[PDB]
Amino acid sequence: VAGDAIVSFQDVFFTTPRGRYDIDIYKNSIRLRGKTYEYKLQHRQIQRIVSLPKADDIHHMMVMAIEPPLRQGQTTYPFLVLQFQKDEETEVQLNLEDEDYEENYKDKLKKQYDAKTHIVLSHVLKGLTDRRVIVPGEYKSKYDQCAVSCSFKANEGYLYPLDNAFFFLTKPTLYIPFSDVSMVNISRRTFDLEVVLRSNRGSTTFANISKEEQQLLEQFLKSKNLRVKN
Ligand SMILES: [Cl-]
Ligand SMILES: [Cl-]
Ligand SMILES: [Cl-]
Ligand SMILES: [Cl-]
């Protein structure tokens, strides 16, 4: 039961971990309730929240970085990836007493929402967890996209140059803050982008990015104060 939750999002599709979960949100925790696994995640465990559209024009994604990572049986998840039909909507009233709403939440939550599901979820997460929801910034690829196709290790994905980070989706998911970057290395009709980390923590290469995309990537990263050698 979840009668005690402030608000629940029922039957949400997560692509990682793969399955459908209810998301019961409380003042200091979220309970993820699946068919096989249930997990109580502290708000403190949520390091980052990213909301972005899929290349689809059908789906919207939300991504939560989790530390310590979520567990199901033996196996460990540093990122939760949730997926929504971009047009589905949610109408919901928060289960908060009026005085409790007024004392603690009047400036960061509404009592009633009626909006796209991912937008309601963003707002409730912001208000309850006090985290920023990161959205795609000024970067816009040669063909007016938020991201470029490439691979990390063998793994085909998309790299989003966000305003303050590199973000790779979806297998595996990686988030590298710019404040963790020592420098970038562009080597060669595709190119490889090496993100060298500070504190001798190594480097992460995003391989086989279209060459057409090099110049705008280079300029955006330099405008963000990163050392870009090519
Ligand atoms: Cl769905
Ligand atoms: Cl379920
Ligand atoms: Cl709680
Ligand atoms: Cl809103």
Swiss-Prot record:
It is found in: Nucleus; Chromosome. It comes from the Eukaryota. Belongs to the SSRP1 family. Component of the FACT complex, a general chromatin factor that acts to reorganize nucleosomes. The FACT complex is involved in multiple processes that require DNA as a template such as mRNA elongation, DNA replication and DNA repair. During transcription elongation the FACT complex acts as a histone chaperone that both destabilizes and restores nucleosomal structure. In contrast to the orthologous protein in animals and plants, this protein does not contain a HMG box DNA-binding domain. This function may instead be provided by the HMG box of the associated NHP6A/NHP6B proteins in the FACT complex of yeast. Present with 22400 molecules/cell in log phase SD medium. Forms a stable heterodimer with SPT16. The SPT16-POB3 dimer weakly associates with multiple molecules of NHP6 (NHP6A or NHP6B) to form the FACT (yFACT or SNP) complex. The FACT complex interacts with the CK2 (casein kinase II) complex subunits CKA1, CKA2, CKB1 and CKB2 and the components of the transcription machinery CHD1, CTR9, PAF1 and CDC73. The FACT complex interacts with the PAF1 complex. SPT16 interacts with SAS3 and POL1. Interacts directly with RFA1. This is FACT complex subunit POB3. The lineage of its organism: Eukaryota, Fungi, Dikarya, Ascomycota, Saccharomycotina. The chain holds residues 237 to 474 of 552 of the full protein.
